[PDB]
Short mmCIF file of C-alpha atoms and ligand atoms in Angstrom, two decimals:
data_model
loop_
_atom_site.label_atom_id
_atom_site.label_comp_id
_atom_site.label_asym_id
_atom_site.label_seq_id
_atom_site.Cartn_x
_atom_site.Cartn_y
_atom_site.Cartn_z
CA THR A 15 87.73 116.30 -19.07
CA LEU A 16 89.87 114.30 -16.78
CA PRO A 17 91.95 115.86 -13.99
CA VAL A 18 95.46 116.92 -14.89
CA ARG A 19 96.98 115.40 -11.76
CA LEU A 20 96.49 111.87 -13.10
CA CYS A 21 97.64 112.66 -16.66
CA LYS A 22 101.14 111.65 -15.67
CA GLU A 23 100.11 109.05 -13.07
CA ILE A 24 98.11 106.88 -15.50
CA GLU A 25 101.11 106.38 -17.81
CA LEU A 26 102.75 104.24 -15.08
CA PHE A 27 102.45 100.49 -15.36
CA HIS A 28 101.48 100.12 -11.73
CA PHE A 29 98.56 102.53 -12.12
CA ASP A 30 95.41 101.49 -10.28
CA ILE A 31 92.01 102.74 -11.42
CA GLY A 32 90.23 101.49 -8.27
CA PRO A 33 89.97 104.85 -6.53
CA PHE A 34 88.31 106.50 -9.52
CA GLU A 35 85.16 104.49 -10.34
CA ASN A 36 83.39 107.78 -11.17
CA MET A 37 85.94 108.28 -13.87
CA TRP A 38 86.50 104.80 -15.35
CA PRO A 39 84.62 105.40 -18.64
CA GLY A 40 86.33 108.77 -19.03
CA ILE A 41 89.76 107.26 -18.47
CA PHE A 42 89.08 104.93 -21.40
CA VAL A 43 88.36 107.82 -23.77
CA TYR A 44 91.37 109.47 -22.19
CA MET A 45 93.54 106.48 -23.07
CA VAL A 46 91.88 106.24 -26.48
CA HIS A 47 92.45 109.93 -27.04
CA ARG A 48 96.13 109.76 -26.10
CA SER A 49 97.10 106.68 -28.11
CA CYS A 50 95.20 106.96 -31.41
CA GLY A 51 94.18 110.62 -31.39
CA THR A 52 91.08 112.57 -30.70
CA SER A 53 90.11 112.27 -34.33
CA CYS A 54 90.05 108.37 -34.20
CA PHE A 55 86.40 107.69 -33.77
CA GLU A 56 83.42 109.87 -34.03
CA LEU A 57 83.38 111.21 -30.52
CA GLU A 58 79.65 110.64 -29.96
CA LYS A 59 79.74 107.03 -31.18
CA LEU A 60 82.67 106.18 -28.90
CA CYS A 61 80.86 107.24 -25.69
CA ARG A 62 77.74 105.33 -26.70
CA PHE A 63 79.76 102.18 -27.32
CA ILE A 64 81.56 102.52 -23.97
CA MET A 65 78.57 102.79 -21.64
CA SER A 66 76.74 100.09 -23.55
CA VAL A 67 79.80 97.90 -22.97
CA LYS A 68 79.64 98.96 -19.30
CA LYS A 69 75.95 97.98 -19.07
CA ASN A 70 76.90 94.54 -20.38
CA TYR A 71 79.31 93.71 -17.54
CA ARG A 72 77.38 91.69 -14.98
CA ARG A 73 77.58 92.60 -11.30
CA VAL A 74 80.06 89.71 -10.75
CA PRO A 75 82.87 89.90 -8.12
CA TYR A 76 85.91 89.92 -10.45
CA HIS A 77 85.19 89.67 -14.21
CA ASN A 78 83.25 92.93 -14.18
CA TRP A 79 83.49 96.54 -15.45
CA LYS A 80 86.41 97.41 -13.17
CA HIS A 81 88.38 94.53 -14.70
CA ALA A 82 87.65 95.47 -18.31
CA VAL A 83 89.02 98.95 -17.56
CA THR A 84 92.07 97.81 -15.57
CA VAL A 85 93.05 95.48 -18.43
CA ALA A 86 92.18 98.33 -20.82
CA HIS A 87 94.63 100.52 -18.92
CA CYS A 88 97.40 97.96 -18.93
CA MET A 89 97.19 97.68 -22.73
CA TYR A 90 97.48 101.48 -22.82
CA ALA A 91 100.74 101.43 -20.86
CA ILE A 92 102.23 98.77 -23.11
CA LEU A 93 101.39 100.58 -26.33
CA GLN A 94 102.53 103.97 -24.97
CA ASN A 95 105.88 102.28 -24.43
CA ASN A 96 105.96 100.48 -27.77
CA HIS A 97 104.80 103.42 -29.92
CA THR A 98 106.84 102.36 -32.94
CA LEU A 99 105.76 98.74 -33.13
CA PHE A 100 101.94 98.64 -33.58
CA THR A 101 99.83 99.52 -36.60
CA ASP A 102 97.40 102.25 -35.95
CA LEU A 103 94.59 99.85 -36.32
CA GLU A 104 95.95 97.28 -33.88
CA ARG A 105 96.24 99.91 -31.23
CA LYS A 106 92.69 101.02 -31.64
CA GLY A 107 91.31 97.52 -31.59
CA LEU A 108 93.60 96.30 -28.91
CA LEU A 109 92.20 98.85 -26.53
CA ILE A 110 88.63 98.20 -27.72
CA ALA A 111 89.31 94.44 -27.61
CA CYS A 112 90.63 94.88 -24.07
CA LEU A 113 87.61 96.82 -22.77
CA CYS A 114 85.32 94.17 -24.29
CA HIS A 115 87.41 91.03 -23.74
CA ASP A 116 85.09 89.86 -20.88
CA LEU A 117 81.60 90.85 -22.05
CA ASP A 118 78.66 89.48 -20.06
CA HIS A 119 80.69 87.28 -17.74
CA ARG A 120 78.76 85.05 -15.38
CA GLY A 121 81.49 84.32 -12.83
CA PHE A 122 82.08 80.77 -14.06
CA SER A 123 85.09 79.10 -15.70
CA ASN A 124 84.68 77.26 -19.00
CA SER A 125 84.96 73.96 -17.11
CA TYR A 126 81.83 74.91 -15.20
CA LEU A 127 79.97 75.57 -18.44
CA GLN A 128 81.37 72.43 -20.04
CA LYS A 129 80.90 70.00 -17.12
CA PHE A 130 77.24 71.16 -17.02
CA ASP A 131 76.41 71.21 -20.73
CA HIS A 132 75.68 74.98 -20.60
CA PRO A 133 74.34 76.31 -23.84
CA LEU A 134 77.48 78.33 -24.31
CA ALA A 135 79.47 75.11 -24.35
CA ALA A 136 76.99 73.99 -26.95
CA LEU A 137 77.62 76.97 -29.11
CA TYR A 138 81.29 77.31 -28.27
CA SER A 139 82.80 73.83 -27.85
CA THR A 140 86.10 75.40 -26.70
CA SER A 141 87.20 78.82 -25.45
CA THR A 142 83.57 79.03 -24.49
CA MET A 143 83.21 82.43 -22.86
CA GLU A 144 85.72 84.15 -25.19
CA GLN A 145 83.93 83.23 -28.42
CA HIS A 146 80.95 84.64 -26.51
CA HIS A 147 82.78 87.79 -25.41
CA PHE A 148 83.49 88.39 -29.09
CA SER A 149 79.83 87.69 -29.86
CA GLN A 150 78.63 90.30 -27.37
CA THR A 151 81.29 92.62 -28.81
CA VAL A 152 79.92 92.41 -32.37
CA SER A 153 76.33 92.85 -31.21
CA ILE A 154 76.95 96.07 -29.31
CA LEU A 155 78.96 97.32 -32.29
CA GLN A 156 75.95 96.57 -34.50
CA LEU A 157 73.77 98.67 -32.27
CA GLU A 158 72.95 101.68 -34.43
CA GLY A 159 75.21 104.65 -33.73
CA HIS A 160 77.59 102.31 -31.90
CA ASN A 161 79.65 101.14 -34.88
CA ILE A 162 82.83 103.18 -34.50
CA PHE A 163 84.73 101.37 -37.25
CA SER A 164 82.20 102.49 -39.86
CA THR A 165 84.94 105.10 -40.37
CA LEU A 166 87.06 102.36 -41.95
CA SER A 167 87.28 100.75 -45.33
CA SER A 168 85.58 97.38 -45.38
CA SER A 169 89.06 95.84 -45.74
CA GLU A 170 90.34 97.84 -42.77
CA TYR A 171 87.07 97.00 -41.04
CA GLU A 172 87.39 93.21 -41.30
CA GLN A 173 90.97 93.56 -40.01
CA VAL A 174 89.99 95.34 -36.74
CA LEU A 175 87.53 92.55 -36.07
CA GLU A 176 90.19 89.90 -36.66
CA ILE A 177 92.57 91.68 -34.31
CA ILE A 178 89.79 92.20 -31.76
CA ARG A 179 88.66 88.60 -32.17
CA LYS A 180 92.08 86.96 -31.81
CA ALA A 181 92.94 89.09 -28.79
CA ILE A 182 89.65 88.12 -27.18
CA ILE A 183 90.26 84.40 -27.74
CA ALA A 184 93.84 84.83 -26.56
CA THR A 185 92.61 85.75 -23.09
CA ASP A 186 91.67 82.06 -22.84
CA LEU A 187 94.38 81.24 -20.30
CA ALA A 188 94.35 77.61 -21.47
CA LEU A 189 95.65 78.81 -24.84
CA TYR A 190 98.23 81.06 -23.18
CA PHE A 191 100.58 78.23 -22.18
CA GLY A 192 101.07 77.08 -25.76
CA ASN A 193 101.46 80.66 -26.96
CA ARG A 194 104.16 81.53 -24.42
CA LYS A 195 106.11 78.25 -24.68
CA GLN A 196 105.91 78.77 -28.46
CA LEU A 197 107.20 82.33 -28.15
CA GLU A 198 110.00 81.12 -25.86
CA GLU A 199 111.31 78.89 -28.66
CA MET A 200 110.89 81.53 -31.41
CA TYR A 201 113.02 83.82 -29.23
CA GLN A 202 115.62 81.18 -28.43
CA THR A 203 115.91 80.23 -32.13
CA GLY A 204 116.19 83.80 -33.41
CA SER A 205 113.08 83.03 -35.48
CA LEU A 206 110.87 85.87 -34.22
CA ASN A 207 109.69 88.06 -37.08
CA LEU A 208 107.65 91.17 -36.36
CA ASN A 209 106.61 91.26 -40.05
CA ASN A 210 105.11 87.76 -39.83
CA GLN A 211 101.37 88.13 -39.16
CA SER A 212 100.90 84.97 -37.07
CA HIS A 213 104.04 85.96 -35.19
CA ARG A 214 102.33 89.28 -34.47
CA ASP A 215 99.21 87.41 -33.40
CA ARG A 216 101.09 85.40 -30.76
CA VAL A 217 102.75 88.55 -29.48
CA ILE A 218 99.39 90.33 -29.32
CA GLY A 219 98.03 87.28 -27.53
CA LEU A 220 100.75 87.34 -24.90
CA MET A 221 100.18 91.06 -24.46
CA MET A 222 96.54 90.25 -23.87
CA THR A 223 97.51 87.70 -21.19
CA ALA A 224 99.89 90.09 -19.47
CA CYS A 225 97.18 92.78 -19.52
CA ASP A 226 94.56 90.34 -18.25
CA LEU A 227 96.69 89.29 -15.32
CA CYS A 228 97.98 92.79 -14.57
CA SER A 229 96.45 92.78 -11.10
CA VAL A 230 99.54 90.83 -10.03
CA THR A 231 101.54 93.83 -11.33
CA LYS A 232 100.19 96.49 -8.91
CA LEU A 233 101.33 97.77 -5.56
CA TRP A 234 100.81 95.19 -2.80
CA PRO A 235 97.72 96.79 -1.20
CA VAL A 236 96.13 97.08 -4.65
CA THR A 237 97.19 93.55 -5.47
CA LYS A 238 96.13 91.90 -2.20
CA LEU A 239 92.77 93.68 -2.33
CA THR A 240 92.08 92.54 -5.89
CA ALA A 241 92.86 89.02 -4.70
CA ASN A 242 89.88 89.11 -2.34
CA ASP A 243 87.63 89.66 -5.33
CA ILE A 244 89.23 86.95 -7.47
CA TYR A 245 88.50 84.25 -4.91
CA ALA A 246 85.03 85.65 -4.10
CA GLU A 247 84.10 84.79 -7.68
CA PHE A 248 86.08 81.52 -7.63
CA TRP A 249 84.71 80.32 -4.31
CA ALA A 250 81.25 81.20 -5.58
CA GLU A 251 81.78 78.69 -8.40
CA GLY A 252 83.00 76.31 -5.72
CA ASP A 253 79.71 76.73 -3.86
CA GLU A 254 77.67 75.63 -6.85
CA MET A 255 79.75 72.45 -6.97
CA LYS A 256 79.05 71.20 -3.46
CA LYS A 257 75.33 71.79 -4.00
CA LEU A 258 75.93 69.51 -7.02
CA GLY A 259 78.04 67.06 -4.99
CA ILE A 260 81.43 67.34 -6.72
CA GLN A 261 84.05 68.76 -4.39
CA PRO A 262 85.56 71.72 -6.28
CA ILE A 263 89.24 72.13 -7.00
CA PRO A 264 91.34 73.79 -4.25
CA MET A 265 91.43 77.15 -6.06
CA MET A 266 87.66 77.37 -5.59
CA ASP A 267 87.09 76.21 -2.01
CA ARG A 268 86.19 78.74 0.70
CA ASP A 269 87.17 76.11 3.28
CA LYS A 270 90.78 76.34 2.03
CA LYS A 271 91.44 80.10 2.26
CA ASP A 272 94.54 79.40 4.35
CA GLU A 273 96.27 77.69 1.45
CA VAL A 274 95.57 80.79 -0.71
CA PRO A 275 98.96 82.52 -0.11
CA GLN A 276 100.90 79.51 -1.28
CA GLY A 277 98.55 79.05 -4.19
CA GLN A 278 99.35 82.56 -5.22
CA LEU A 279 102.98 81.75 -5.07
CA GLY A 280 102.53 78.85 -7.42
CA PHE A 281 100.33 80.79 -9.82
CA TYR A 282 103.05 83.43 -10.01
CA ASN A 283 105.85 81.00 -10.59
CA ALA A 284 103.97 79.01 -13.25
CA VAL A 285 101.75 81.56 -15.00
CA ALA A 286 102.52 85.14 -14.05
CA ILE A 287 106.34 85.14 -14.05
CA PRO A 288 106.80 83.19 -17.32
CA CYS A 289 104.27 85.53 -19.02
CA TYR A 290 105.91 88.85 -18.10
CA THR A 291 109.32 87.23 -18.65
CA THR A 292 108.69 86.40 -22.31
CA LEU A 293 106.93 89.75 -22.46
CA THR A 294 110.12 91.49 -21.39
CA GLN A 295 112.30 89.33 -23.63
CA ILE A 296 110.21 90.37 -26.64
CA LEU A 297 109.15 93.89 -25.55
CA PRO A 298 111.99 95.15 -23.32
CA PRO A 299 110.12 98.28 -22.17
CA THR A 300 107.39 96.18 -20.54
CA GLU A 301 109.67 95.20 -17.74
CA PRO A 302 108.07 97.25 -14.88
CA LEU A 303 105.29 94.67 -15.22
CA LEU A 304 107.79 91.87 -14.54
CA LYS A 305 109.43 93.88 -11.78
CA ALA A 306 106.13 94.60 -10.02
CA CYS A 307 105.15 90.95 -10.37
CA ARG A 308 108.41 89.97 -8.65
CA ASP A 309 107.74 92.44 -5.82
CA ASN A 310 104.33 90.88 -5.26
CA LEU A 311 105.82 87.37 -5.45
CA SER A 312 108.08 88.27 -2.51
CA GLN A 313 104.96 89.45 -0.70
CA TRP A 314 103.03 86.22 -1.11
CA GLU A 315 106.33 84.56 -0.16
CA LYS A 316 106.64 86.88 2.85
CA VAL A 317 102.99 86.09 3.68
CA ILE A 318 103.46 82.31 3.56
CA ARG A 319 106.53 82.68 5.78
CA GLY A 320 104.78 84.89 8.36
C1 DZU B 401 94.24 77.04 -2.77
C2 DZU B 401 94.69 77.40 -4.17
C3 DZU B 401 95.18 76.42 -5.03
C4 DZU B 401 95.58 76.72 -6.33
C5 DZU B 401 95.50 78.04 -6.75
C6 DZU B 401 95.03 79.04 -5.91
C7 DZU B 401 94.62 78.72 -4.62
N1 DZU B 401 95.05 80.28 -6.55
C8 DZU B 401 95.51 80.02 -7.77
C9 DZU B 401 95.54 80.97 -8.86
C10 DZU B 401 94.86 82.10 -8.85
C11 DZU B 401 94.53 82.89 -10.03
C12 DZU B 401 93.86 82.33 -11.10
C13 DZU B 401 93.55 83.07 -12.23
C14 DZU B 401 93.92 84.38 -12.32
C15 DZU B 401 94.60 85.01 -11.26
C16 DZU B 401 95.01 86.36 -11.27
C17 DZU B 401 95.64 86.89 -10.18
C18 DZU B 401 95.88 86.08 -9.09
N2 DZU B 401 95.54 84.81 -9.02
C19 DZU B 401 94.90 84.26 -10.10
N3 DZU B 401 95.82 78.68 -7.95
C20 DZU B 401 96.47 78.06 -9.08
C21 DZU B 401 97.23 78.82 -9.96
C22 DZU B 401 97.57 78.32 -11.20
C23 DZU B 401 97.17 77.05 -11.58
C24 DZU B 401 96.44 76.28 -10.71
O1 DZU B 401 96.10 74.99 -11.05
C25 DZU B 401 96.58 74.47 -12.30
C26 DZU B 401 95.56 74.72 -13.38
C27 DZU B 401 95.99 75.82 -14.36
N4 DZU B 401 94.87 76.61 -14.87
C28 DZU B 401 94.93 78.01 -14.45
C29 DZU B 401 93.81 78.81 -15.10
N5 DZU B 401 92.83 77.91 -15.72
C30 DZU B 401 91.68 78.66 -16.23
C31 DZU B 401 93.47 77.16 -16.80
C32 DZU B 401 94.78 76.55 -16.33
C33 DZU B 401 96.09 76.76 -9.45
MG1 MG B 402 88.11 86.60 -19.76
ZN1 ZN B 403 89.78 89.13 -18.31
#
């Protein structure tokens, strides 16, 4: 039973879940209930699944429960504004996939795991944590009384995994660049085809990147505050590198906080802005994401300038 006041306020793209930690796992069911129905999943299964997912978000600074829900929300906003375009399955999974996209995150980029032969880089040669976030996803699903897609036909089943799986791998920011430069061409050549499955996959994947970065798309106090937590997990990875001798990259160096505003500026102009741009080119209604990103770009600009 969520409060009625927010009912309208959560449908906004700039909605921030921060002030409502109490409510985060309700909000999900809320967003699930509004998109796909109340008769989507067996109600009791769906709450089990959710808090188990919650339990399996480490107490990391950034890639933690709050983040899974914020992303989760941003996927909600996009699908509420693109009603017509997404199968009923996709929707379901895309919100599930979003809530689970970062399961059991340690606070460490793939490069950390792969420069230090972590087992995960042994299992997952590439896209290391994502292949793992899907792994964790399956396992919690295969908890008894947690499988919510038991409702489906085995051929609808295997399809909600393959959506879920691709969207989880697509949050691998290293794969984003190809995806979005590839979608830029397909747009510019008139060769985008919503009926083409792989074409849908790329679009889903860009939606997953826009969702995953959506902290850049909030109001400036929300956005600046979330930035504190992004570097607290970055710089932490930096720490473990000096202890191991290698000076970490600038992104991850507590001794270079002062260069952070300009680094934000360059992340926006090379990752954030291209992503919501192609997002708006393909899905026109998603443009308040782009517009909020631009507002925050000005801010980091205005911060660099004094
Ligand atoms: C001092 C300093 C220097 C560079 C900084 C920096 C600070 N902060 C960033 C980016 C903050 C960032 C990174 C990831 C997700 C956010 C979400 C919201 C806000 N910010 C951020 N960057 C930055 C931004 C983009 C790229 C970059 O270096 C080029 C490498 C590109 N990477 C980017 C991501 N990796 C995993 C794969 C490809 C550096
Ligand atoms: Mg992730
Ligand atoms: Zn994420």
